Amino acid sequence: TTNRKDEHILYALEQKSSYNSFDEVELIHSSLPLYNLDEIDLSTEFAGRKWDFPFYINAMTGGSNKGREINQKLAQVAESCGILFVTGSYSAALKNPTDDSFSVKSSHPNLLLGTNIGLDKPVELGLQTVEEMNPVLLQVHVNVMQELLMPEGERKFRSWQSHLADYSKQIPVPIVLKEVGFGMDAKTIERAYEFGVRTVDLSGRGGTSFAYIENRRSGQRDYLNQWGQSTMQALLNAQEWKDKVELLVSGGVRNPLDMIKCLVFGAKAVGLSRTVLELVETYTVEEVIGIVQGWKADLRLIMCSLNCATIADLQKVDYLLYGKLKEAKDQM
Amino acid sequence: TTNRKDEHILYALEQKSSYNSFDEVELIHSSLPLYNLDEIDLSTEFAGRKWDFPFYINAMTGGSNKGREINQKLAQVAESCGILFVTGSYSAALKNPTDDSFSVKSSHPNLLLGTNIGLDKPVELGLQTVEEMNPVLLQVHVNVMQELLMPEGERKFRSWQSHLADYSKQIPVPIVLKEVGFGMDAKTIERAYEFGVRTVDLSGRGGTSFAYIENRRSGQRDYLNQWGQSTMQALLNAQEWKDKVELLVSGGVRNPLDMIKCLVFGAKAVGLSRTVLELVETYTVEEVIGIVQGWKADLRLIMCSLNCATIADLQKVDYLLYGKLKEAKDQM
Amino acid sequence: TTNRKDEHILYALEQKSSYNSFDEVELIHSSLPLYNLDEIDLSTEFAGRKWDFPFYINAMTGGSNKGREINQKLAQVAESCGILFVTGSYSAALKNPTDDSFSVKSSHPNLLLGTNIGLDKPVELGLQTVEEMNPVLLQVHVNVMQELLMPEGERKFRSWQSHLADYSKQIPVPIVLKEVGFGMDAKTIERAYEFGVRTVDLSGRGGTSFAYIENRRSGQRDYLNQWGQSTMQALLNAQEWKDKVELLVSGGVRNPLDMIKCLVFGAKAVGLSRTVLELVETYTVEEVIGIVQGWKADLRLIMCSLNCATIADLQKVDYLLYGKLKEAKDQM
Amino acid sequence: TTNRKDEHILYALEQKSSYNSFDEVELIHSSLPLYNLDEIDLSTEFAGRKWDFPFYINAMTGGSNKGREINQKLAQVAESCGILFVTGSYSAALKNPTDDSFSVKSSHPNLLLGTNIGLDKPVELGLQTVEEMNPVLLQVHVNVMQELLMPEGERKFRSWQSHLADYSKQIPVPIVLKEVGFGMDAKTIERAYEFGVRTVDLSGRGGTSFAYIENRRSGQRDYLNQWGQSTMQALLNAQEWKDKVELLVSGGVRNPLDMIKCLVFGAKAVGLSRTVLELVETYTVEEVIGIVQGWKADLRLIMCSLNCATIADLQKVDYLLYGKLKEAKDQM
Ligand SMILES: Cc1cc2c(cc1C)N(C[C@H](O)[C@H](O)[C@H](O)COP(=O)(O)O)c1[nH]c(=O)[nH]c(=O)c1N2
Ligand SMILES: Cc1cc2c(cc1C)N(C[C@H](O)[C@H](O)[C@H](O)COP(=O)(O)O)c1[nH]c(=O)[nH]c(=O)c1N2
Numbered sequence A, B, C, D: 001t002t003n004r005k006d007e008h009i010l011y012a013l014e015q016k017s018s019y020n021s022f023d024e025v026e027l028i029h030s031s032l033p034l035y036n037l038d039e040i041d042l043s044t045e046f047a048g049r050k051w052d053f054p055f056y057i058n059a060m061t062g063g064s065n066k067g068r069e070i071n072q073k074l075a076q077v078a079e080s081c082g083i084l085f086v087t088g089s090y091s092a093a094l095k096n097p098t099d100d101s102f103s104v105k106s107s108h109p110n111l112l113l114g115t116n117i118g119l120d121k122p123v124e125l126g127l128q129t130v131e132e133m134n135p136v137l138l139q140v141h142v143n144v145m146q147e148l149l150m151p152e153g154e155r156k157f158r159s160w161q162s163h164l165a166d167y168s169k170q171i172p173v174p175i176v177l178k179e180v181g182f183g184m185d186a187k188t189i190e191r192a193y194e195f196g197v198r199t200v201d202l203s204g205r206g207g208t209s210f211a212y213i214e215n216r217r218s219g220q221r222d223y224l225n226q227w228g229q230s231t232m233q234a235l236l237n238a239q240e241w242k243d244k245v246e247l248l249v250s251g252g253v254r255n256p257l258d259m260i261k262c263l264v265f266g267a268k269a270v271g272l273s274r275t276v277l278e279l280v281e282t283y284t285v286e287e288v289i290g291i292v293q294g295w296k297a298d299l300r301l302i303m304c305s306l307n308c309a310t311i312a313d314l315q316k317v318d319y320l321l322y323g324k325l326k327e328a329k330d331q332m
């Protein structure tokens, strides 16, 4: 378990992306402005509350000493910046109750803390996770291709739909059905909606790939590294659901313009893993806090240049698609 | 004859592909699964029988000492893995009855063995081939451009249609009209169907090119190396025929995902030559058997990720096309 | 102020363009000609007068010693060639009345001289600018993204629309609403038109980028370097306005064919900054005059090859679009 | 005059093409053949006669010692192979009656000889050309952009239409209106047709460019090197005229497949300059004759692979377009 956690960190950081669907989106700007920078509002709503900011640190780690170190650093960045921080899968702490790598709330009482568990875990373990972590939301992840590429992975999936119904019926905090970089498909969103799920994380291809990661671990099956749908394609494919389900978007988000692009297409908020992980591995925590504060300023200036005074206003922004996104749209 | 056989092997392995149409197909996956890996069924039907697996070793060699060696190795892989193995053209053994390079059945009694002859050969030779080889099916190949690029090649083709009618009327095993990498066109499929042919191998461009090979042998006419239609284009062009004729697909199949892509478009099974030839030239036979067993596991996991419990289910999978395939579809 | 002016010159010249939308436009020529070269007329009309030529030197500099040097050289080229020369923003001279870097008219009495001020400056400063410079027109620039990327930049924009109304009502020379390389959007043109603006400079992306420049100065935010719409995209997006507002076009104009392409789409005239700046930095003033004279000859020969005897005739020329421009047109 | 002729040869051979529109055309082949190679007929009709073969050596040279050498070699290739050979512009021999570089008929009595003159020359000179050369046809070339890029070039074109009417009315051999690599436009074809012209050479962009050549000579104006329409685009744009005017096609023809592609779109015959010039500069005349004989064999084999027994049959061949040709077709 501990070695897998550290290999995930290692190989995620090693990965080099060669395609990012955000680069196939162009926004039509506004030459003549309407607003002052100081009036631009960054707030959004999802999972039963209003949030000051429209981006969050997405599920990564916990379950090893390196995970403990990373989680402490992420918790400090998140608390200081007033943003949501979701830990990696809590399963490691269920198997080893001595594990203190997820225990960041005690020292960070103002932290907005979410946590994460796999849909393969029975609802009893989800309940235990929520009871132990007291999170603001629970991500319930779906990672079929990752499990199948792992020698130690799950092989039976018949129970997952029944599990999802159980989580929806029993978990006392908001649940977010959570992809892991393969891009959540519309049929899955429909099924989740039917079970009562009202928030999803589309987490698509373009950034971290767990096919790449598990294939580095196994040394096999590289031909599957580009499995799934890109982040923008998953978001475009989900448009019919954008007002019935809260769409959180992640996967290859590098910068505030990528965030804005998600919001233009009706995302409620935008998650980052690799970008933030790399920052914490490269700079001091104080420096990372400065960068994240800078992201807020960048969001406001981009919105100002788009004549948008609120996050909701972004959905009115006109755009052009190119390349693969455009070719795919021709077929939809 | 023997030198041509060995040059075919040499130049086929030397060839480097720069375009593969499978890379212009994207499958829409399923984040929320339905099935257990152990319930995924790989069986298919064509040429009058049910097959345990949906891929086969396609026609290559025989007629030289190297061909004998390769055929023994392929027969061992095929028998061990329970898959169809089709020999190269049997004409060499008709011309030289001493040739034992095709005689793999005697030592491999559980082998599913097919064989191959050119449509230029009169039906009497086809009958002799079937009588001598006792195959489960007979591929009857069409290779006009290859013949024309060969100094020793055929120059008269008026008789080929009459030959095809003869084979259809007289051969007592199922016949498969077989392309050799130029991509079987729809008009040919229609004509074949009219004669009573019910199974074809579309074998398109993207993998081994016999224009490339014969042009290496002759040192001339490289400008024809990309003759014909790509494997995916031939398959898409054949869609109107997919339920009146059994479409077998080959040409540039590298891995199990390429196989799955063929099946998504209604192929009954998928043939491999170069990929398997390279494996047998690189690894021990035992190692190749392991790789092929691994392909079965990979097919099941890809199907699981696509929520497909049977081969037939794959035809329901949604997709996106890009690049040349997309541009061509715009014109169809 | 002086250091910013010189950094603008430095970084503008350092910039290397990797995309130019003019290269995605193809003109259908005429094999059989109609006209003599000596009868081709280059005249155009905008901002209340007829001009002998359809290109001009666009706003750049003034406000430093290097700016004084450059402005003297540009004034000599412009006067000798009978073309419009627009200075950079005059704000530096408003803040420092000792500044003589814009004072080129006194030595060049036949110069067609325009000047420039930011829309952030109250109309009283615009009036002072016009009174001091006696220009043939006043460009009023909009540069929101540039201001936001500058540490010393504007942060309040609520007043800009009211300013534009004031300038339209009060300035006694023609005004041109002026982009700075981000590509003026159609909604801005509509708003400007409503206020009484009748001439705009679309100045789009493809040549000098002030995102690139300010980001070089700050060392941050390179992910915004390609902000805005390309020159051709802005021109195509403005087609509904081409006969209600005079469209001047600039941004990445390299040569006379780029000029012709703008005119084919109904521009009244074409502005150049970087190309002319680089010429004056590379060659003697006498040599630059020769090159600019050569541009006139080139315009005539291109028009002759297109069977166009006047600038207006160019709007009848047929064309093909490719790449991004074509993909964007598919979406409009 | 002599130095210009030799510079044309030099720079034409130096040129490297980076785009060839023939590479954006794919032909749908026939897997099941109908015909014998020995029954495939290569004959065609244009300019008042039947021709044994559908390709010709297009206008190049004459007017210098090197031109005399090249013309003797081309005449020997053409006579031996039974194909049309068109000399370069005869104007040099009109200005210098001592010039013997075009005098190839006397030694080659079975030669099919055409000649060439510019439309700028009055009909009296065209008549003198035909009287002196006794050609089977007269190409009358249009090269406006080339003339304009030449320091010694024509500057007055008002007379060209009247000249064309004169040539049509007076010249006693068939006339071919002849482009020089810029791609003859449909409006020109219409005008020519109205004057009585019934054969044109579309000579488009993709091979030799006289913009490139004249710009190498002058050292200026490289930005015009890609002027005009590609060979395939000119041919596609001319489709409405293909049965009212005989379309000869040239420009970047490299090999027999390029020839076939022209014929698929209704060309009567296909011209080659650079390819044949390079052959004569690289190989012995005997070797070039072998290569050209080989082209005939290649045409037959390609036709056989397309189930075409005659040149006319090629117009029934199905195709796919890609890239720029496809994008342009989307706009037509
Ligand atoms: C090191 C590491 C570890 C994990 C992850 C990522 C990384 C980088 N991810 C997946 C993550 O939340 C996200 O879906 C993808 O990484 C895509 O986003 P980025 O491109 O990395 O921003 C993840 N997802 C999840 O739901 N539970 C988890 O425990 C983990 N573990
Ligand atoms: C060495 C070798 C030899 C042969 C072949 C191939 C190779 C590699 N192929 C063609 C083969 O069955 C298939 O159509 C193509 O090779 C395309 O598939 P791959 O891209 O190689 O998988 C072949 N086809 C056939 O019908 N009869 C034959 O005798 C042969 N001979």
Ligand SMILES: Cc1cc2c(cc1C)N(C[C@H](O)[C@H](O)[C@H](O)COP(=O)(O)O)c1[nH]c(=O)[nH]c(=O)c1N2
Pocket: C008, C009, C012, C058, C059, C060, C061, C087, C088, C089, C116, C139, C141, C178, C179, C180, C181, C203, C204, C206, C207, C208, C209, C250, C251, C252, C253, C271, C272, C273, C274, C275, C277
């Ligand atoms: C050195 C320098 C300085 C300035 C500029 C440019 C350059 C190169 N530009 C912007 C200019 O007018 C034009 O909009 C862009 O440069 C795009 O055109 P080019 O691609 O450079 O031809 C400019 N624009 C403006 O309205 N007022 C100004 O003061 C300046 N300053």
Ligand SMILES: Cc1cc2c(cc1C)N(C[C@H](O)[C@H](O)[C@H](O)COP(=O)(O)O)c1[nH]c(=O)[nH]c(=O)c1N2
Pocket: D008, D009, D012, D058, D059, D060, D061, D087, D088, D089, D116, D139, D141, D178, D179, D180, D181, D203, D204, D206, D207, D208, D209, D250, D251, D252, D253, D271, D272, D273, D274, D275, D277
């Ligand atoms: C050395 C040389 C000289 C000439 C030419 C070409 C070359 C290579 N070309 C143009 C020629 O006929 C043809 O239109 C173009 O060269 C395009 O065809 P290729 O791409 O070269 O096959 C030519 N055309 C013409 O009508 N009269 C001429 O005198 C000449 N001169």
